[PDB]
Design an enzyme around this catalytic site. Sequence first.
Site, PDB file in Angstrom:
ATOM      1  N   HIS A   1       0.826  -1.216   0.000  1.00  0.00           N
ATOM      2  CA  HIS A   1       0.000   0.000   0.000  1.00  0.00           C
ATOM      3  C   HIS A   1       0.845   1.243   0.000  1.00  0.00           C
ATOM      4  O   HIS A   1       0.453   2.261   0.579  1.00  0.00           O
ATOM      5  CB  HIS A   1      -0.969  -0.001   1.185  1.00  0.00           C
ATOM      6  CG  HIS A   1      -2.005  -1.111   1.123  1.00  0.00           C
ATOM      7  ND1 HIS A   1      -3.257  -0.919   0.634  1.00  0.00           N
ATOM      8  CD2 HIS A   1      -1.930  -2.462   1.486  1.00  0.00           C
ATOM      9  CE1 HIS A   1      -3.937  -2.080   0.683  1.00  0.00           C
ATOM     10  NE2 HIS A   1      -3.133  -3.017   1.215  1.00  0.00           N
TER      11      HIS A   1
ATOM     12  N   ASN B   1      -9.890  -2.795   3.179  1.00  0.00           N
ATOM     13  CA  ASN B   1      -9.723  -2.788   1.724  1.00  0.00           C
ATOM     14  C   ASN B   1     -11.071  -2.554   1.045  1.00  0.00           C
ATOM     15  O   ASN B   1     -12.116  -2.618   1.699  1.00  0.00           O
ATOM     16  CB  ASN B   1      -9.181  -4.132   1.251  1.00  0.00           C
ATOM     17  CG  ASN B   1      -7.676  -4.260   1.444  1.00  0.00           C
ATOM     18  OD1 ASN B   1      -6.952  -3.262   1.555  1.00  0.00           O
ATOM     19  ND2 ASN B   1      -7.194  -5.513   1.468  1.00  0.00           N
TER      20      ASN B   1
ATOM     21  N   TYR C   1       2.008  -4.774  12.109  1.00  0.00           N
ATOM     22  CA  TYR C   1       1.824  -3.306  12.053  1.00  0.00           C
ATOM     23  C   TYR C   1       2.542  -2.573  13.168  1.00  0.00           C
ATOM     24  O   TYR C   1       2.890  -1.420  12.993  1.00  0.00           O
ATOM     25  CB  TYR C   1       0.335  -2.881  12.050  1.00  0.00           C
ATOM     26  CG  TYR C   1      -0.422  -3.293  10.802  1.00  0.00           C
ATOM     27  CD1 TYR C   1      -0.705  -4.630  10.554  1.00  0.00           C
ATOM     28  CD2 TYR C   1      -0.869  -2.337   9.869  1.00  0.00           C
ATOM     29  CE1 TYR C   1      -1.401  -5.027   9.416  1.00  0.00           C
ATOM     30  CE2 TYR C   1      -1.576  -2.723   8.722  1.00  0.00           C
ATOM     31  CZ  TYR C   1      -1.842  -4.076   8.509  1.00  0.00           C
ATOM     32  OH  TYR C   1      -2.543  -4.513   7.396  1.00  0.00           O
TER      33      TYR C   1
HETATM   34  C1  HDD Z   1       1.171 -10.069   8.465  1.00  0.00           C
HETATM   35  C2  HDD Z   1       1.302  -9.223   7.469  1.00  0.00           C
HETATM   36  C3  HDD Z   1       0.082  -8.593   6.902  1.00  0.00           C
HETATM   37  C4  HDD Z   1      -1.186  -9.214   6.513  1.00  0.00           C
HETATM   38  C5  HDD Z   1      -1.638 -10.658   6.580  1.00  0.00           C
HETATM   39  C6  HDD Z   1      -1.917  -8.024   6.024  1.00  0.00           C
HETATM   40  N1  HDD Z   1      -1.250  -6.846   6.074  1.00  0.00           N
HETATM   41 FE1  HDD Z   1      -1.890  -4.919   5.637  1.00  0.00          FE
HETATM   42  N2  HDD Z   1      -0.128  -4.187   6.012  1.00  0.00           N
HETATM   43  C7  HDD Z   1       0.935  -4.873   6.533  1.00  0.00           C
HETATM   44  C8  HDD Z   1       0.985  -6.169   6.856  1.00  0.00           C
HETATM   45  C9  HDD Z   1      -0.071  -7.159   6.612  1.00  0.00           C
HETATM   46  C10 HDD Z   1       2.162  -4.030   6.861  1.00  0.00           C
HETATM   47  C11 HDD Z   1       3.476  -4.504   6.247  1.00  0.00           C
HETATM   48  O1  HDD Z   1       2.413  -4.009   8.276  1.00  0.00           O
HETATM   49  C12 HDD Z   1       1.672  -2.658   6.450  1.00  0.00           C
HETATM   50  C13 HDD Z   1       2.645  -1.812   5.610  1.00  0.00           C
HETATM   51  C14 HDD Z   1       2.672  -0.400   6.224  1.00  0.00           C
HETATM   52  C15 HDD Z   1       1.921  -0.558   7.517  1.00  0.00           C
HETATM   53  O2  HDD Z   1       1.685   0.303   8.359  1.00  0.00           O
HETATM   54  O3  HDD Z   1       1.450  -1.897   7.655  1.00  0.00           O
HETATM   55  C16 HDD Z   1       0.310  -2.924   5.812  1.00  0.00           C
HETATM   56  C17 HDD Z   1      -0.347  -1.919   5.175  1.00  0.00           C
HETATM   57  C18 HDD Z   1      -1.793  -1.927   4.857  1.00  0.00           C
HETATM   58  C19 HDD Z   1      -2.592  -0.747   4.409  1.00  0.00           C
HETATM   59  C20 HDD Z   1      -2.134   0.662   4.163  1.00  0.00           C
HETATM   60  C21 HDD Z   1      -2.510   1.425   5.440  1.00  0.00           C
HETATM   61  C22 HDD Z   1      -2.141   2.856   5.184  1.00  0.00           C
HETATM   62  O4  HDD Z   1      -2.832   3.484   4.356  1.00  0.00           O
HETATM   63  O5  HDD Z   1      -1.136   3.358   5.763  1.00  0.00           O
HETATM   64  C23 HDD Z   1      -3.931  -1.295   4.233  1.00  0.00           C
HETATM   65  C24 HDD Z   1      -5.219  -0.619   3.807  1.00  0.00           C
HETATM   66  C25 HDD Z   1      -3.749  -2.694   4.622  1.00  0.00           C
HETATM   67  N3  HDD Z   1      -2.492  -3.065   4.923  1.00  0.00           N
HETATM   68  C26 HDD Z   1      -4.899  -3.612   4.664  1.00  0.00           C
HETATM   69  C27 HDD Z   1      -4.901  -5.062   4.846  1.00  0.00           C
HETATM   70  C28 HDD Z   1      -6.142  -5.880   4.680  1.00  0.00           C
HETATM   71  C29 HDD Z   1      -7.538  -5.484   4.321  1.00  0.00           C
HETATM   72  C30 HDD Z   1      -5.608  -7.211   4.933  1.00  0.00           C
HETATM   73  C31 HDD Z   1      -6.335  -8.496   4.922  1.00  0.00           C
HETATM   74  C32 HDD Z   1      -7.424  -8.646   5.637  1.00  0.00           C
HETATM   75  C33 HDD Z   1      -4.181  -7.006   5.235  1.00  0.00           C
HETATM   76  N4  HDD Z   1      -3.790  -5.721   5.205  1.00  0.00           N
HETATM   77  C34 HDD Z   1      -3.291  -8.118   5.558  1.00  0.00           C
END
Ligand code: HDD
Lengths: 674, 672, 353
Positions: free
Chosen positions: A62, A135, A349
């Site tokens: 994202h 999402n 996160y």
């Molecule tokens: C275990 C790892 C993992 C899993 C299974 C998911 N994510 Fe995630 N997501 C992350 C690890 C992550 C992350 C790497 O931790 C991020 C990158 C930047 C942050 O703050 O968290 C992230 C970013 C991130 C953002 C951007 C937030 C922003 O605008 O700053 C969104 C909307 C989502 N994710 C949504 C989801 C949804 C709807 C998931 C399934 C239900 C999902 N993520 C599963």
Amino acid sequence: SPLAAYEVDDSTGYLTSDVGGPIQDQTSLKAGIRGPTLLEDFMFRQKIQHFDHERVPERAVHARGAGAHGTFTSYADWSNITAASFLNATGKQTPVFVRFSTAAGSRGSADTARDVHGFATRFYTDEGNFDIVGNNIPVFFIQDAIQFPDLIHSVKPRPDNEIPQAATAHDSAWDFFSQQPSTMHTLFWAMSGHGIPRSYRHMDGFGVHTFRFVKDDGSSKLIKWHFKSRQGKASLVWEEAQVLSGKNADFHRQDLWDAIESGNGPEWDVCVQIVDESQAQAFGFDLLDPTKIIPEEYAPLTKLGLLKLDRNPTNYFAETEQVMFQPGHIVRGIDFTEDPLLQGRLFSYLDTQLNRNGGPNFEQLPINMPRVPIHNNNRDGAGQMFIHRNKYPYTPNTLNSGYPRQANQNAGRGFFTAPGRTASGALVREVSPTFNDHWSQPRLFFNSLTPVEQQFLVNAMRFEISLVKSEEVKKNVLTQLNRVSHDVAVRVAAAIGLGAPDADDTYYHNNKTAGVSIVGSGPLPTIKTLRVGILATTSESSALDQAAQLRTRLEKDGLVVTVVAETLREGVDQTYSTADATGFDGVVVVDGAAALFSSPLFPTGRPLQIFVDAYRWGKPVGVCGGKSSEVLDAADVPEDGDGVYSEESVDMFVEEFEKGLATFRFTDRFALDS
Amino acid sequence: SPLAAYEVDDSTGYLTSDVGGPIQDQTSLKAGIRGPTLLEDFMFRQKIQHFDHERVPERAVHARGAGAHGTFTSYADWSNITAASFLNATGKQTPVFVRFSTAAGSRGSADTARDVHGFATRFYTDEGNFDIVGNNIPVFFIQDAIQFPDLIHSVKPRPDNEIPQAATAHDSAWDFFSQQPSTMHTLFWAMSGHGIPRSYRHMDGFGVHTFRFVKDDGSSKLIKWHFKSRQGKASLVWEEAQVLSGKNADFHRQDLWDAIESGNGPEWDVCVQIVDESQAQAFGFDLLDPTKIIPEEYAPLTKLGLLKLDRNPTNYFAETEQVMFQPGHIVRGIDFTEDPLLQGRLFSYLDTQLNRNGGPNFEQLPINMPRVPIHNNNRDGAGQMFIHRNKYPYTPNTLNSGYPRQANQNAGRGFFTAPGRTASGALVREVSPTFNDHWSQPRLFFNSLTPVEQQFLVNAMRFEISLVKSEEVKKNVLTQLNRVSHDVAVRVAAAIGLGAPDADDTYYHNNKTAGVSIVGSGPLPTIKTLRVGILATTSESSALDQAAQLRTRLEKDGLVVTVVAETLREGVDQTYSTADATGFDGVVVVDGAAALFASSPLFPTGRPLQIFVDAYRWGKPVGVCGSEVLDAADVPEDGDGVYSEESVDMFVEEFEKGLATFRFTDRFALDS
Amino acid sequence: TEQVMFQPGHIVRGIDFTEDPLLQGRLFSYLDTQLNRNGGPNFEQLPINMPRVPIHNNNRDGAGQMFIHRNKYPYTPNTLNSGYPRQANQNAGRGFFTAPGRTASGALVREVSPTFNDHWSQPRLFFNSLTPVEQQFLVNAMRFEISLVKSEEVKKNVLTQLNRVSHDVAVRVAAAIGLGAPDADDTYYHNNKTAGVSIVGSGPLPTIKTLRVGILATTSESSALDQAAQLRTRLEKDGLVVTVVAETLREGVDQTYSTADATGFDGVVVVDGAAALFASSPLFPTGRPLQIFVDAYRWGKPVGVCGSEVLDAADVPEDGDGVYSEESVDMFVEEFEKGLATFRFTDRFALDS
Ligand code: HDD
Ligand code: HDD
Ligand SMILES: [Ca+2]
Ligand SMILES: [Ca+2]
């Protein structure tokens, strides 16, 4: 303005260093007028050091996205279902910040890539920050957080050459999808118009996971968050999204910015489906499984309140880039479930912000700060902005009189885990067999799309799979698609010159579900902010007169009008050289301009191409002034076509055209498989 | 070399942690089969922590780019002009790594944005790493490094909403340009075809600054680096570049990867203009001024050696993302000049690696390591990968027997500052009056372009300036353009609904210079790697036969041929659905497919014809092998770069010449 | 304290640098090293590092950005923010400016100025300016440290250098380490002195407020605690920090013998009612009360007995300078307070021949 206290004004004054010494920053200090620069030039070094260190790591997913501030207002006192303070009174208001995003692409990739989209919302509640990290698609690719890097590695660019940017249209992604069939449901969503929304404002938000609502008396219910857009559902068509990516990489962020700046801030109803704990396996699947939706037919929506975004950020880096969401930002009244995808996110996160911020005090950034007092014994760390008065930061203590006091279910409005939750059994790395049906719900989704919508999905798959080089992967893809729908496998197989495998009907059915179709969701409920391009000419003073009258009439209804001509002058907004059909939701030619339809001022055939592209992409198109056949014939646009308009009267033209903007897309202009 | 030792092979074996313990990574450890995940699941946490921390900050500028390994070979013993060891013998080979890039866009932005482009070369010499961190344009926007953040803030997206990506087409950029007239020269280059090269292989590289060559006897001469492409000069047309930005953001990195994989690695002659120290101010401008070129008419090019790129990276992040260039990576025999832009760069590139690497040991990354032993008293710091045996790392010492020894002009082939360099005068924050002509050289450059090329440059300015909201910014821009050329200002103002100011002839002149025109540089010296799209149909077996015949013939010449049809099958590479004219340098329709050029669920309406029509409009060679089609396309049979034959062999002779001509510029309208 | 980040680069109008090559390089180091400590470029935003005036510049972004900048045109020159922030210089906005009389000339060199070459005359000037016992302390510091150097080669090299400063220093230091000093080399010898560099020769202390007085007492005698309390009242009124020490804590007693040491006091007084302790207890290590008194004496501190076989037990001469013995509370306080001003009685230290 929520963050006023942290704003820095530079509309007056003399340049200073970061420590307030007035300086200059335009010429280096040199030994002689044509001499070498001196190390003692601190003005140079402080300025360039800052510049050299401006960048931070982009989000691991994202990375590409845009944000805005707003307000949430509760429709009721929801104490009957949750202890959450932000939901405890009719009309209660809480500030919010929302960031929207694509998922796969880096910073600087295009808004209109085909992808899942992020919809992340922070509620700055009077009992702490509460984040719903969602999402625009209600289900996720995978069933366990531990597989996240496999998914993301597969859909991100190949790691030898970093190709292709922001796209699933390559071997590794389709290899993963075909080997990991859980992916099918989200894949079918992403291959539909949901993969290419018209704007952030025309998509919904989903928490995806089942969460719990927990009452002050400790009882709980299972919930799914659904943010339903008040702007309507709308998509691009693929060819349009491709051109947009090149003509305006910033399309969605510009659309959001402009809508807010014009006093048209987007709105969603914040809703839940609520069900009893006893219904975790009552609907034919497991509520712990994030690849499943609860069909609306089994659980209707409760509208909790109104979300409105109405203020753009002041500094994008400080607010939008630095906002750090966490599903771990939870408040009393809400709890987690044992969804193994959710469970792992809780870890990620918190950890990932260390990478982005480079230090442990990321919650102190203005955008991440709560709107209530903080009392804890967290101390030190790089970038520590607080000066803590309490010199006895341990529990238990007498030297600070037992403060801070412990908060829990009974005292201090503490968070508490739903007390009815239990665990039983062996400690295992095993998948629940209740998670095993990967195909019935993708088929339910596909069944709920209109015929032309199903064609679009098949065409998205034909597009991407045709770009997969490996014949084995392509064959493995058809194997999975065929488990969802033999017809889909056959129609996709036809584009790639393989044969579909024989029908395997284990998971076939004909059931449908409401509320998932874009094309079947009806005319938009509002046309405000939609874009009308008036193609005109400077050769004829009558063309510019028609354009002005038309503008006046359309702007009255809140449409965004762009008059296009060969060159700019008063009343002309854009030249043909910069104009493109992807810039408009509707295209009108003024009949004074009929002759345009070769100049050093724009590429050969451009005015016509704008009209023709608009038509081919399903947009409402017309000719205003009374003389239409020259333009329509040159374009090969039939005069009696649905969504094709021709009237002498401005008032009458606009009334018909405005219906077409509401209909949005004329789907009869697209060929269907026979 | 230090790279092979760090290559990791995962083509066999069981999954392990980073400490070699065999593990699984597909299911979380839970308290019961439908229970909560456990904190003691170290397999989960190590894997997700690594994922969580994968990203590093993108480069502050030139964030979007691609690299390759190769070799430099010296043509002579150059001891007569420089002590530099990598130039000290005929045929001496030095490994290199080159990274090419755009300048303004973030790491996921399109290759084909209009921009200055980076061309950064590392020579891993036997006397240390030497980098030449250059661009595809010979002059830079500003005359003092201290202004770099001003330039970059102005061109990068507006900082309230971060719009627009990878583009100078907005108010702030044009506000800066029109308030800082030193920008004019680079601006005219970026608004020319040089802002949108056809590939990294079809552009040149320039050091920009004047540097010195220093001999072992201490004497010095002033030099300019010019890497001259063996592939020729070539650009996209703007509309093409815009479509490419959407259809294939990876266009240049893809082009480079493919050329290397096919054994067509790109080559450059590494050249210098060499002049005496006495000529610093002899050519009508100051050689310390990075906004100025030395016209080839005053100083011819000397060919020093051959640069060839011929091996792609194994891991993009480890090699291309992590390569950390510095102009401070200098070797004995080269020295700096008092160019105030160069001067400040030396500071920036050392400092900024702290940001990207998060630690001070970034020269230990395999891609940054030298090929010779390292002896110094640098110690500790996060990510320290060495175990130093010398327990007395200070000079002067006796406890380590006075080692390492100091190297200098006399001892140990040390780097040494050119000993004739001096400084004199007040300590000042003043600009030399010698830097003050901002307009004559842009005019020289403009005069040196062909008429159609001049028109493209006017049109690029018309495009961008028409997007500037502020009327006062637009007026200020016209003021500056007018000082370069009244005719440019008139023609630009015509498109934006303003009047040009009256001619101000102070800097006008009619001089031209050689080697700066793309259109004027003649046909490409080679057509290998160029792309031919053959548009065919599955409806006629004849069409497929024709395509196969053309393919075998074109492929023998090193052309990359794509047969396009409605659906894939043996013989067919791409569907019409995924095909675009931007994917080809030439387009041939096989006449058995005539019928497609007048609806299908397999592709958008009019796609086959649009490919041909776009290709024609963009100046590419187009053809029909075997009237219907050209008439449908509104393409004149007699037009140059339009081929109609029945004979495959003859079609091929003629079409291959058109590919060398590359663009047929007569298809573009000119101002009256 | 931990996060304060100083820089000689933090300079203001009215002050400028010089071409001191040590100063020159520091300017670079202090800006760069804050990146290591803070982990990011926004270290000047830490409250302790912030200025007390507004900040106007075009520095942006960076990890840990705590500001929200409202100027969306952070480049100079601009018209879109009306040319703000404005350039400050000698003639505008009270800007810093480099001293306009400064010049440079000559070759670009990595050469040391020959004017820097005298490394030995000022060390000699300093040494000459110290009192005899001060010179002895310095010789003894060098004897201590150099005796710990294993290498015979380094020790000899050290004597070579010390000898260029003072032959006598090299002789006396050599004596302790079993080597012979090299022959006198008088190139840099001289007899000149300078004011204000000696500690011992700088006179009694201008105030005694804050100085610490340890009163060694006993719980076994009610008289001992009475005397202690009486001293305390008097001494505390003169700003001295008084610690009454006894076997165990109780009203009026601050510190047990177990935790007490002479290093905790600038002066030590025994209340005579406690003579018994100075002649075994599970409450403190063997001979602790005496050792404190003895250490305080040996280290040159004012010591006293208030109420003299203690002095015998401690081998302290009754008549010694900075040794006090009075039954008069007021007389003792008065004299002892003069001892604290004198601070050290340097006649208690042995000198080379
Ligand atoms: C275990 C790892 C993992 C899993 C299974 C998911 N994510 Fe995630 N997501 C992350 C690890 C992550 C992350 C790497 O931790 C991020 C990158 C930047 C942050 O703050 O968290 C992230 C970013 C991130 C953002 C951007 C937030 C922003 O605008 O700053 C969104 C909307 C989502 N994710 C949504 C989801 C949804 C709807 C998931 C399934 C239900 C999902 N993520 C599963
Ligand atoms: C004082 C600041 C400054 C100035 C005046 C310039 N640059 Fe620079 N340049 C940087 C500061 C910088 C930087 C911030 O230090 C970068 C970003 C990442 C890096 O390694 O250095 C950089 C990156 C960078 C790259 C990318 C290298 C790579 O591929 O990794 C190239 C090709 C150039 N620059 C070339 C130039 C040329 C031809 C210049 C004008 C003659 C120039 N730069 C002026
Ligand atoms: Ca791949
Ligand atoms: Ca702008």
